[PDB]
Antibody, heavy 214, light 213 residues
Framework: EVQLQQSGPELVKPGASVKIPCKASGYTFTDYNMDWMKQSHGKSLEWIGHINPNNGGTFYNQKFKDKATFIVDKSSNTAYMELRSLTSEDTAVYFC?????????????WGQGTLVTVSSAKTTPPSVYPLAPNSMVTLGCLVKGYFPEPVTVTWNSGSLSSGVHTFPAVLQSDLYTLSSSVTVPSSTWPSETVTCNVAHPASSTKVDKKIVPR | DIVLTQSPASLAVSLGQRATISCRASESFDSYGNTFVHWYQQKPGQPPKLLIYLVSNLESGVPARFRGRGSRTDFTLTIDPVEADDAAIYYCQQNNEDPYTFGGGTKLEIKRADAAPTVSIFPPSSEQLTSGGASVVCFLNNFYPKDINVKWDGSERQNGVLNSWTDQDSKDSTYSMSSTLTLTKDEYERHNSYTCEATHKTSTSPIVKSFNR
């Protein structure tokens, strides 16, 4: 099956550049364009341009001429988009998508998106605090005082996901805080084990906080 | 460029009913060949996902609840019947002319029966206490509709109260929210009862959770 796989989130200083990979598999890479999109937070998408991997050719949305460069590594079926002279206006999710081959068409296959945050603020890992307290029981995980976004949260590595609510982070005094609840039967907890799995890619934090009965 | 204006900006549609989402091009597209207008569904934190391509063709794997039509400058996505899984933002897109462009998006809310929140309060964990910090957390889970009010020792305090709503759940069409009252160590240690009362149009009486310390 077709897969487009992008890099993880990126914190970049103002004025610097970043390069975003998009690795393709499940089809013959040189048959199709690779297109690139930008989506600012809370906003619609903008098409940056595309590259023809077969022959190296490119077309840029004029608006992105001073911002984006496309290249491909035919050798590894990886398309790349470089963004230069970064400002806060470039903070956004960037997506690759497979484009036209023999003729124009829709974007049927997309990469997962990569978040680029432009800031010169320092990186701060979160503290992960457990929350302990009735046929059902709700348990929590508090992820506090981090920068930048994102963190990811799972419960028992994703096997337990059915009664999870993970709340969007709030920015406070230059720091994000996020929470996440989970609800399971009384019979299963505190009887057997529940832990939240928290990662903060920007600091390489990966914590497992077990929910201990108080 | 060719500007695509979507209508409505938002709508709320009951389960089983019809949602009509419009896209208007700033100028007409050209009759030589096909018309490259496509429709996508996008949920939070995901790429958009293709529904309809070349105005009216159904992408394989997409159910026939989704239909596209149009011509020249007017294009229509219909979702009938609407289901819980449709809670999303929808976009039209054109690649008839450079640069390619997307509509501004239409946010579909699923309207369902009103639902009271389940409310849980949590005192700060001792791990957090060892760091000289005290946060008291309240979860308000699986309610409808979205509009909701929450109030946190006998009396009240809004200073240090970070709130946060989820998007619409795509299985049961509910919303959840999370209120975190945070305050200092010797400040927290200095009090008694902590209550989150929440009020919501599912009842007269606020739902009250609390603990003594």
């Amino acid at each position: 099956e077709v897969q487009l796989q992008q890099s993880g989130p990126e914190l970049v200083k103002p004025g610097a550049s970043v390069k975003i990979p998009c690795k393709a598999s499940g089809y013959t890479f040189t048959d199709y364009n690779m297109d690139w999109m930008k989506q600012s937070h809370g906003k619609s998408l903008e098409w940056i341009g595309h590259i023809n991997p077969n022959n190296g050719g490119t077309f840029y949305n004029q608006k992105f001429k001073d911002k984006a460069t496309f290249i491909v590594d035919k050798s590894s079926n990886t398309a790349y988009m470089e963004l230069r002279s970064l400002t806060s206006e470039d903070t956004a999710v960037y997506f690759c998508a497979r484009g036209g081959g023999l003729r124009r068409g829709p974007f049927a296959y997309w990469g997962q998106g990569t978040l680029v945050t432009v800031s010169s603020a320092k990186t701060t890992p979160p503290s992960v605090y457990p929350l302990a307290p009735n046929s059902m029981v709700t348990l929590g995980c508090l992820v506090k005082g981090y920068f930048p976004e994102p963190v990811t949260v799972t419960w028992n590595s994703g096997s337990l996901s059915s009664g999870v609510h993970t709340f969007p982070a709030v920015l406070q005094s230059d720091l994000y805080t996020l929470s996440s609840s989970v609800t399971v039967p009384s019979s299963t907890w505190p009887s057997e084990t529940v832990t939240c799995n928290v990662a903060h890619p920007a600091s390489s934090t990966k914590v497992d906080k077990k929910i201990v009965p108080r | 460029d060719i500007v695509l204006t979507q209508s409505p900006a938002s709508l709320a549609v009951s389960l089983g009913q019809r949602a009509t989402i419009s896209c208007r091009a700033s100028e007409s597209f050209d009759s030589y060949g096909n018309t490259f207008v496509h429709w996508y569904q996008q949920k939070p934190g995901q790429p958009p996902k293709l529904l309809i391509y070349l105005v009216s063709n159904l992408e394989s794997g997409v159910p026939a609840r989704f239909r596209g039509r149009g011509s020249r400058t007017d294009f229509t996505l219909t979702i009938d019947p609407v289901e819980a899984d449709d809670a999303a933002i929808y976009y039209c897109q054109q690649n008839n002319e450079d640069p390619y462009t997307f509509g501004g998006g239409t946010k579909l809310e699923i309207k369902r029966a009103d639902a009271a929140p389940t409310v849980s309060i949590f005192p700060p964990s001792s791990e957090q206490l060892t760091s000289g910090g005290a946060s008291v957390v309240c979860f308000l889970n699986n309610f409808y509709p979205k509009d909701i009010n929450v109030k946190w020792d006998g009396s009240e305090r809004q200073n240090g109260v970070l709130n946060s709503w989820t998007d619409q759940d795509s299985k049961d069409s509910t919303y959840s929210m999370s209120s975190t009252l945070t305050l200092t160590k010797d400040e927290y240690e200095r009090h008694n009862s902590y209550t989150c009362e929440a009020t919501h149009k599912t009842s007269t009486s606020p739902i009250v959770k609390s603990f003594n310390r």
